[PDB]
Design a protein around this nucleic acid. Structure first.
Length: 86
DNA sequence: ATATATATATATATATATATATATATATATATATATATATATATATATATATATATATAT
C-alpha cells in the first residue's frame, strides 16, 4: 500500500546497526548500495542521532554519534551507544 | 519216623535312580566412579540512572 524503503537499503541499514560497520572487502553488494544512496541512509539514521562516517580510501562505513555541534556538553552521551572501558 | 526241600525273619551286598551338596566358571546386572561439556554462580572494574541531602529562592 504505502511506500516502503527499498529492500536493499533496509538490509544495509539493519546490518550497519547490528555490526556497526560495512566493508567492501566482505560485503560489496551492501557497501556499494549505501554509497550510491547516502542521502537515504543519512535520512534513516538522523532521527536516532546516528550518522555514517565513510572512509573511501580503506573501503569502510561506520556509525557514529550525530549529536549536536559542540553544545554546552563538552562530552557526548547517547542512550543506545553504551560506552565501555576495555 | 526218615530224608529231602522249602519257606520265614533279618541283615548284608550290589545295582539303579533320584536328589542334594559342593565347587567352579560364567554372564549378567548393577552400582559406581570418572570424565566431558555445559551451565551457573560469585567477584571486580566501570558506566549509567536513581534517589537523597543541602542550599537557594518565592510566598506568607
Amino acid at each position: 500500500s504505502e511506500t516502503r524503503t527499498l529492500q536493499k537499503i533496509r538490509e544495509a541499514t539493519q546490518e550497519l546497526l547490528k555490526y556497526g560497520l560495512l566493508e567492501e572487502a566482505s560485503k560489496p553488494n551492501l557497501y556499494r548500495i549505501v554509497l550510491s544512496h547516502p542521502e537515504e541512509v543519512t535520512r534513516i539514521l538522523e532521527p536516532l542521532d546516528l550518522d555514517i562516517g565513510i572512509d573511501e580510501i580503506r573501503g569502510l562505513l561506520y556509525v557514529k554519534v550525530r549529536l549536536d555541534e559542540t553544545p554546552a556538553q563538552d562530552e557526548w552521551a547517547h542512550p543506545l551507544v553504551r560506552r565501555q572501558r576495555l
